[PDB]
Design a protein around this nucleic acid. Structure first.
Length: 1073
RNA sequence: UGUGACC
């Protein structure tokens, strides 16, 4: 409940010259007492009278009623920031060292010096792209500095380390003033021309870093990064994190977890000697020197100290730096520079061609329907993103312009222009428009925004490839339902004194031009073989059109902006934007390592324990018939880089016997680590989400970092959420939502009152509000209705339906309509109509919570039903598992030491249900977990129709609707749907083994009948309650269940009428991965 | 309609 208190200290800090608490209650009498109180407060305020008396008079409302929101009548003029900052600006401002960055515009020159005129200006290279101001970040940091002014012992030392660093930011800002943002949180020319171009963005990164400082080591790290980053905006992060790829090969393995035959983590007390050739030490030194040459002092020393003994026990500091390096910010170059950098491949292409065959051989040979109706599949999968050009579009009786793909496909069909048979050119005549990918530390990469003919032509084939990968282990990122802990265990598995692991970053090869030929050619060569495997007109065309996208891209041309002009240049590299990007890249990176290993074999003899491709890295574990020596590693390493060299691939290739480091994960000393570098106060690009949506994403980002090892003070995050979630009524009237409003599991949830613990309403008031918010979940959009009524639209839906099903529709048809009415949301005009409505709705809600006919059941009610039938009792669980993920907080790690961990994702889509597999053998349709959920619960005769209506043959549609399987699917669907509503795959829970024998011990559930649905939810509700108590208390409890039999039937019914909830918190989790 | 692919 501490949020509602911290909220007032904040407003009482920001505004000084009133606050009007607004309460509400599910109880009539108490509510009028709330209504009355509100009034008297407004009135007294509108007379400068003390509210102290009303707070006593209505002591009842303050005690039993629920805080809904807080009114903020501040009559200043959004200033304060100006004044406030001076106190902290006593240090000497920083002076940009305009000689550190190559490209001139990467140096912190004065804005004007980069853009002499307002028409030449562009924030494109510094835009924080977030819906929160720099001004407020400042306010937030001082608010905290104040609150912890009079701290003691260690807490003070945290304040002192921060008071300093914040001076740097303050001193440097005051020298130019505080940049003022506009209605869209953008920094325009007038305000930026004076201050250094990168002032704002750098402020954001420094504040975000200093607020995540605790230990003296943090302070040392923040300090450096904050100072060097004011001048270096391009090599800092790569410099500060480059060493880590060598360090992993230094720490010895003294016990680690491995993967067993059941594909699960298991402890192995073994020892593996880290063998490092001297040459490696030189490389690591050159890296330490490079860091030094760039100003770096403190950080290099830390790695040097650690280098004396290299103890996995002191390694934590190395990982801390590795994660901090990213918080410097994103490297946003100019489209042109980003794009500018861009006989022995016989073996390499032969592999790409064969691998492409293995993945479609069966699908093709058996005239797979997916491949036949590939075009239709492409249409249902179509998104609402960009097609490239802004077309003029007429809908019904309205002429509007859009770039959306879903729009262009409709308008084009309604005019005979729809022609997926013809795959448009992407050469000099029709240059490829470009997109960009920005990341911290790495250089900017460009992206192709190809026309939809390309998606449709690739969709089906790519989905068949992803399936082959799903059950192929070399494809780490696609294999089974596996998470990263399984990949972690596969490496450590064969590590012994007679084997060495070989990791490799191939991100620079995929972008190379030397690659584009063997690539496309290898695929095409494969598509040919496949074509000579069938005679199916449908299959050969879908397979033919795919061959055409590869040929059109062999010689592509790109539209690179160069100021306010769009130069067209011939691009001879494989960029990315295709449907086959990830799959093809994986196929390629794998064919690569296979080629390298095969080559080096001629010299040395080894065994291939494992080969893996995962994103932009690939790796292998080799076994030798003798013991590995520092001289053997060197020899293998040289011949590997040398092999990569003869292919003209600029790639980083290292060799060790204990660790590996790749973009997604890194294994040091037998343990697993995940870079904690998600930026908080700066975003890659601007989307279309709301501030509320962004508040949730910030918190979501907070959580992931925190689990990964980088923690930002939770009071700072809470502060930010207060700013971002507020709503202005007028210019002096600002409304701030309460803890109950922002954390309750509703459609407006932003974060969990307690980290790592998701609560569900267990009080009438909580339920009250919960039902209210839903009442106004989805809002209308005029523009959306108009277009949802237009001919071109209805014909699209209709045309899609008539192609899919045979008999009647409705369940499916009502779906295709909506799925299409939603895609119109990417269209800003509609997006904006929606928000405006949400705000007014929410504006009147946090003013006097409306009514609601309820009648809708949510996972909340199900649980609130069960709760009362469980008896708690103190229990004890000893710690038995050793820590394998060192950065985890303590309360989360404890859980894992007691109950264990898992290496998989709990099926939450229902794809493993027989019915879903049936509909896949005959239909290109894909029902969601929520549709299968409603379907499976229909009367036997209705299911038989649905199936046959989608093309499922009677012998099969009938053999199912009765079989044991059907009855089963019923349970498995609901199981999948419920695991979905409980976020068993996100946050903290995704880590925990919910089938731990140790955990099962603490759950005593006597069967008083035998009805699966009820047995399931009771056990789950118990496992969650037990784990939550442990997450909050550090101790365990045992749960006993005495749930009646007469109740189990009432429940079972509720169970099948659950409604899913949509919210910022929910969408934040999906946005994660 | 300051917007910019695959996922």
């Amino acid at each position: 409940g501490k949020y509602n208190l911290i909220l007032s200290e904040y407003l009482s800090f920001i505004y000084n010259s009133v606050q009007i608490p607004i309460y509400y209650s599910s109880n009539s009498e108490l509510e009028n007492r709330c209504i009355e109180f509100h009034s008297k407060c407004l009135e007294n305020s509108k007379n400068g009278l003390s509210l102290r008396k009303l707070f006593v008079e209505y002591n009842d409302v303050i005690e039993n009623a629920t805080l809904l929101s807080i009114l903020s009548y501040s009559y200043d003029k959004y200033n304060a920031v100006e004044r406030k900052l001076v106190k902290y600006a006593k240090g000497k401002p920083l002076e940009a060292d305009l000689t550190v960055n190559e490209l001139d515009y990467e140096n912190n020159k004065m804005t004007s010096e980069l853009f002499p005129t307002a028409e030449e200006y562009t924030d494109s290279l510094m835009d924080p792209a977030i819906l929160t101001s720099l001004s407020s970040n400042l306010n937030a940091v001082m608010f905290w500095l104040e609150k912890h002014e009079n701290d003691v012992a260690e807490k003070l030392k945290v304040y002192k380390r921060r008071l300093d660093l914040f001076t740097i930011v303050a001193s440097t800002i005051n020298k130019y003033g505080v940049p003022r943002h506009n209605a869209k949180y953008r920094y325009e020319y007038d305000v930026m021309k004076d201050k250094p171009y990168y002032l704002v963005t750098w402020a954001n990164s420094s504040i975000e870093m200093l607020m995540s400082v605790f230990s003296h080591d943090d302070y040392l790290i923040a300090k450096e990064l904050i100072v060097l980053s004011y001048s270096n905006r391009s090599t800092l992060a790569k410099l500060v994190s480059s060493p880590m790829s060598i360090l992993v090969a230094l720490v010895d393995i003294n016990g680690t977890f491995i993967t067993n035959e059941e594909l699960e983590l298991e402890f192995s007390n073994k020892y593996v000697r880290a063998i490092v050739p001297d040459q490696t030490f030189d490389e690591l030194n050159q890296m330490l020197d490079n860091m030094r040459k760039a100003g770096l002092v403190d950080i290099p020393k830390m790695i040097q100290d650690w280098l004396v003994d290299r103890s996995i026990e002191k390694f934590p500091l190395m990982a801390k730096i590795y994660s901090w390096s990213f918080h410097v910010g994103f490297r946003k170059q100019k489209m042109l520079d980003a794009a500018l950098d861009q006989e022995m491949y016989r073996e390499y292409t032969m592999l790409i061609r064969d691998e492409v065959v293995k993945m479609l051989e069966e699908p093709v040979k058996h005239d797979d329907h997916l491949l036949r109706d590939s075009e239709l599949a492409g249409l249902l999968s179509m998104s609402s993103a960009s097609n490239g050009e802004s077309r003029q579009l007429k809908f019904g009786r309205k002429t509007i312009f859009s770039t959306k793909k879903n729009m262009h496909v409709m308008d084009d069909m309604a005019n005979e222009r729809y022609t997926p048979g013809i795959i448009p050119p992407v050469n000099v005549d029709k240059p490829i428009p470009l997109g960009r990918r920005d990341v911290p530390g790495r250089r900017t990469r460009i992206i192709f925004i190809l026309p939809y003919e390309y998606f449709i032509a690739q969709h089906a084939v790519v989905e068949k490839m992803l399936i082959y990968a799903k059950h192929t282990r070399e494809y780490a990122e696609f294999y089974s339902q596996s998470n990263q802990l399984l990949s972690y265990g596969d490496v450590t598995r064969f590590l012994s004194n007679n084997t060495m692991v070989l990791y490799t970053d191939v991100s620079q090869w995929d972008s190379s031009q030397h690659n584009t030929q063997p690539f496309r050619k290898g695929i095409i060569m494969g598509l040919d073989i496949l074509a000579n495997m069938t005679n199916d007109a449908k299959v050969l065309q879908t397979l033919n059109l795919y061959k055409q996208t590869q040929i059109n891209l062999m010689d592509s041309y790109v539209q690179i902006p160069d100021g306010n002009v769009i130069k067209k240049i011939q691009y001879g590299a494989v960029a990315s934007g295709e449907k086959q990007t990830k799959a093809a890249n994986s196929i390629a990176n794998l064919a690569l390592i296979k080629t390298v290993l095969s080559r080096i074999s001629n010299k040395h003899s080894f065994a291939t324990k494992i080969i893996r491709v995962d994103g932009d890295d690939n790796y292998a574990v080799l076994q030798f018939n003798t013991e590995v020596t520092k001289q053997m590693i060197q020899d293998v390493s040289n011949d590997v880089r040398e092999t990569y060299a003869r292919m003209n691939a600029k790639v980083k290739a290292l060799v060790s016997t204990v660790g590996i480091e790749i973009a997604k994960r890194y294994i040091a000393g037998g343990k697993i680590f995940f870079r904690a570098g998600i930026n908080l106060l700066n975003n890659e690009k601007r989307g279309q989400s709301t501030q509320w949506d962004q508040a949730a994403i910030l918190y979501s980002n907070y959580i992931v970092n925190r689990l990964r090892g980088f923690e930002t003070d939770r009071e700072f995050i809470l502060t930010k959420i207060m700013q971002m979630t507020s709503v202005a009524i007028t210019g002096s009237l600002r409304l701030f939502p309460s803890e109950r409003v922002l954390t309750t599991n509703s459609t407006f949830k932003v974060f969990d009152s307690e980290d790592f613990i998701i609560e569900y309403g267990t009080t009438v008031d909580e339920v009250y509000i919960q039902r209210a918010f839903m009442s106004l979940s989805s809002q209308k959009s005029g523009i959306a209705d108009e277009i949802a009524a237009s001919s071109t639209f209805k014909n699209y839906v209709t045309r899609l339906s008539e192609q899919l099903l045979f008999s009647k529709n409705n369940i499916v048809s009502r779906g295709i309509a909506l799925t299409e009415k939603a895609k119109l949301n990417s269209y800003a005009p509609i997006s904006l109509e929606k928000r405006r409505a949400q705000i007014s709705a929410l504006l009147t809600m946090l003013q006097k919570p409306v009514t609601f006919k309820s009648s809708k059941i949510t996972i909340n009610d199900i649980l609130r039903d069960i709760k009362p039938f469980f008896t708690v009792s103190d229990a004890h669980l000893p710690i038995q598992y050793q820590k394998f993920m060192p950065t985890l907080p303590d309360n989360v790690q404890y859980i894992i030491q007691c109950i264990g961990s898992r290496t998989y994702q709990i099926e939450d889509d229902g794809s493993k249900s027989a019915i879903s597999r049936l509909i896949s053998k005959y239909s290109v349709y894909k029902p969601s977990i929520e549709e299968l959920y409603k379907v499976i619960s229909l009367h036997e005769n209705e299911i038989q129709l649905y199936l046959i209506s989608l093309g499922i043959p009677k012998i099969d549609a009938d053999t199912y609707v009765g079989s044991k399987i059907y009855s089963r699917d019923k349970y498995r669907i609901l199981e999948s749907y419920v695991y979905n509503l409980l976020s068993i795959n996100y946050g903290c829970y995704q880590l925990f083994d919910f089938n731990s024998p140790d955990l099962e011990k603490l759950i005593r559930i006597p069967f008083k009948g035998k009805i699966p649905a009820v047995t399931f939810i009771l056990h789950l509700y118990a496992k969650l309650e037990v784990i939550n108590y442990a997450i909050k208390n550090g101790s365990w409890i045992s749960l006993f269940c005495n749930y009646p039999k007469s109740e189990m039937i009432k429940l079972w019914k509720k169970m099948w009428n659950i409604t899913s909830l949509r919210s910022p918190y929910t969408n934040a989790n999906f946005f994660q991965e």
